[model samples]
Target chain A: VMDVMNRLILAMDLMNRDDALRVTGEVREYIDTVKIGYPLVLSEGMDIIAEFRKRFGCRIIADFKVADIPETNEKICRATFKAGADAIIVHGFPGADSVRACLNVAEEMGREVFLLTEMSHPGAEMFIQGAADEIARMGVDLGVKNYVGPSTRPERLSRLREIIGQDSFLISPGVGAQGGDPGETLRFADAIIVGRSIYLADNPAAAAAGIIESIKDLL
Target chain B: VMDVMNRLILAMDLMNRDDALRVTGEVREYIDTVKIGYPLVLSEGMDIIAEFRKRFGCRIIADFKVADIPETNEKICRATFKAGADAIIVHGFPGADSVRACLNVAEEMGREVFLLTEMSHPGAEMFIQGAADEIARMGVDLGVKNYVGPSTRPERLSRLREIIGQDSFLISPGVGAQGGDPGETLRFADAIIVGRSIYLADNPAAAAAGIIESIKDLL
Candidate 1:
């Protein structure tokens, strides 16, 4: 039961620390959590998470999309939480054992786990589409409440919301530049994860504020 | 094509920099490339890669298993190569666009991309089992010369080799701790990725030497 006030999560996919820190600092007031993915993680490591935690004081989600053996999954999740992330994103494709390993760590650490059921890209349809529902069902059974769904496909998001139940959180990405309409996507998603539309924009703060303003009613 | 002399890759799934460096230094002589996955990347950042590059002086593979939009994929791959990784692993589930984007970056940077067609975990069978062959074929069509297959299932590896052709490099993980027989797995995989059997052993160097010695005739 995490309290996401603004219902907007910033996907900090920037390659450099300067850009990542700058954009996140600018939009700090408008978002609830910052979703740090592979790019920044690969570029800056766990120190970036520590930096964000100290500077912005926002919930940090390490979007590693972890898919590995149970022991490896537990190790990754534990290390991520220790690195200062409030939550972590894991892939459901690896099935229950992998997902459970992460969840177990999250429980032990008092952190959260966001399971990646469906992705925002068109290419994700080849594999994630068919298995998304089952993965969602499995997540619910495993006691996971947060899920990552594609904002690009509102229909799929709506379906996932139905399967996972209305109370569970659904964080959707693929908004703005990726061709996902915020208005349509927010109808089903609990929170919208925006990256390029904000981080790559001329005025990142204003871009983030605009998205937050547009979806204010939903929140 | 990349020349992997030893035909054995070590999965450095350690959480800390000191242990990672110590084990890698001990077994550096026995392996071709050290596979750095999410754990080390999340824990130590890109600096870990730099440290390993300087210390071990061996080929480094960043096993990020990237799955994202094309632009993000390219950016991640480029950053990984720039960070001193000789190659990076991307997930085939995100489809051709994502795979091609990573390949594009690898080509531009004179690096390599290993597509994860199947994983070495039991849980991986749910989503990756049926789609593994299709993904391998797609990787081949996209000009990718390397792939990640499960050593746990030699049958799948053999089938994947048939689909991708013998010339393509198949890097398999799931030796020792995960219950994959090295003898059978190496029969199909161009190279095998071993982790705990060496890293978690009392004497990492001896353990690595033993594995290499046991598989000497196969190579």
Candidate 2:
């Protein structure tokens, strides 16, 4: 059941159209979704997402990492959804009220909200554990349908999946460069998120294919 | 003696002709030094800072509030100095090594490094007080000339002043709309950091003039 979804979500952070086109063309045969992060979104703007939607017909995940007041949060979610995002991620530690604020707008726009659990960077351990617990508790109350956790901490995935249950999709990051084993991460997560390691690989398609197979076998 | 420097600093942040020109056509009579906060600097970019330097003919304070690794910290200090900043602010919690790294770069470039002692935000109290003491000790050891201590609680200013002493410049914020009395802050601080209070005021020039008078009266 999850194998097809895993293959589809084996996307890279397309920082530019040239990179996006190159990666998409390489992985078009296997991957069905692409992750659009802040730097890329800010640099390339909405047209890149629109162009991807037009060319690939694959799902686009807008990782704006949105953290702001309710009004601004609502605007960004709507804008991303309008720009062709199937799912959007927002910070959960902005308090329960802010979490609800993002959820309310996501619900209104008929888009899925991926509550940011743990970040993938090395310094992430400083605050991720406390942040993830708070986010999961709020996600439960707000009925958030998806949660994003770092692939580096399989323990976080195991715990959050228990709270959110199978109904909530867990998007895990740091599958390659950060020494996150796909087989290990998939044991707790529903999908894997890869960035620099795979995107910067000599063979981007092969990197995506290997990770997707690893997740498939584990699931 | 300090009153002259205070007027010079206030002119940079609040009354600078270029900053004033963006919002209103009214001109400022004098300019001295201005603060370029991280958010404003990142959003507006370095060109704006260069323009301010060109128009003001005075010192530029790049308040990047930088907190990073040793190499990255040094790079930020060098970049800010190269961009013509007279002084730059880095977070206090970055520890001795990072502070020294920034200070070394600043000294080599003949720029000043302002350690963030106590940020004036309501939520920042817990870390700032604890972090300020450590930074004060380390900054003195490193021979840093300036320290940023912001507060809504006027008493905190007296406490920080006692720790940092007369030699270190105390840049205080939260002077308006955040319940900080300018008169109370002026009694202890070397330079008052006013942001939203002046930027969002109905009559910014008059508001600046009022605060300028308040500081003078305290002196």
Candidate 3:
């Protein structure tokens, strides 16, 4: 096996079990990690996570975007980690305790929680954007190193990078179908998360390859 | 068969299916709607909602605490409705677009979406409390009919009620084990959501009966 450092993450979510598995397997050579959300998890079951892990030997991020009261957040994280996710994504807007609750569960279960600072959606501008900088500051205050940010806006992404600083790990979503350039996004993010462009492509494997190739010089 | 309006919703979440079903069955006489949160769904699977419906013939509110991008929120709501949830709980802090996405799905699916303006936990004080009133105001602007407020803080709950107005259907959590007074919470919220105080009691049925008795004088 060759050592490959492809800084690409597939934001995987498909309703059907066979197609989800097939598409994931198709792009396994290009992607070593996948972000699974409620769409696929609720459609199939938590068992799907283990299936992806065993079949493809890739890291799975349970992008549940956990936003709840501290007590409920703890239960959700415990169940997610027990289901075999390497890292879980949590929302920071709920404030300190909610994020801390997840961090505790992750520590106990030997998993990581990537705090979501700003999302990659138009609606995010209404409220999330207003509180994002403080949310990132709160993340630093709570000692969180890994964070999820928006690549849709390079200015916003760079602002997030400045707030989170250089050492913390940051992942950006909104490349490809969401209209983000991989090379531009990498200026601030540690890695980029892509969804529709690859997972829904006519040839998913080729799609993944093309994406990586577009940013190949930088990689 | 009886026509009773107890105005009590059980905030149920037991890890094991049998224990959850047994306790719920025990208190069936006092409660008709069970707020099924992620603790139960993630542990036992979404099918539990169908089980709650068939055996008890009660309404199941999937308290998934849906908070995601607008696109992903649509998928989360769709899967939840398809799984037989009568209503789903969503967070408003994520902003207008996220809330609207859920509202759109609920409208299309003939399901209800309860927008949570604030939470019941102590940690809610950190960030949620600041955004609570505005979130409620946003809910009203977006035309949300149902809202969830905190029973732990009566003043905050009252303010939420004022913003949402008397026309909106409101539910309050933090009753029983969370240190919320059921009667006090009922003054602001139409129904009080109770959890551990009844379910974990030696005689859950008796505990539920006692709660109803105490609040009956007010009724």
Model 1: per-residue Cα lDDT over A16-128, one tens digit each: 89989988888887876888987887777678888988888888988888877788889889888998889999989878999999999999999999999988887888778
lDDT of 2 by residue, A21-59 (tens): 887778777767777754454344566777888888578
Off by over 4 Å in 2: A1-21, A28-33, A41-89, A92-113, A127-132, A138-145, B1-21, B24-150, B153-173, B183-195, B217-219
lDDT-based ranking, best first? 3, 1, 2
lDDT per residue (tens digit) for residues A14-73 in model 3:
888899999988988887888899999999988889999889988888999998878789
TM-score of each: 0.96, 0.63, 0.96
Q: For residues B99-196, could you state the per-residue lDDT of candidate 2 as single tens digits?
A: 78888998899877888766665434423454456557777877877776665767767877887788767777666766677777777776666655
Model 2 interface Cα RMSD in Å:
7.3
Error of 3 at B126 (Å): 2.9
Best of the two (1, 2) by lDDT: 1
- Ranking 2 against 3 by lDDT, winner: 3
Under CAPRI classification, how is model 2 graded? Answer: incorrect
Q: Which stretches of candidate 3 lie over 4 Å from their true place?
A: A1-5, B1-5
Q: Global lDDT of each model?
A: 0.86, 0.64, 0.88
lDDT of 1 by residue, B79-170 (tens): 78988999988989878888999988898899899999988888887777878899999999998899988888888988998989988888
Candidate 1 DockQ category? medium
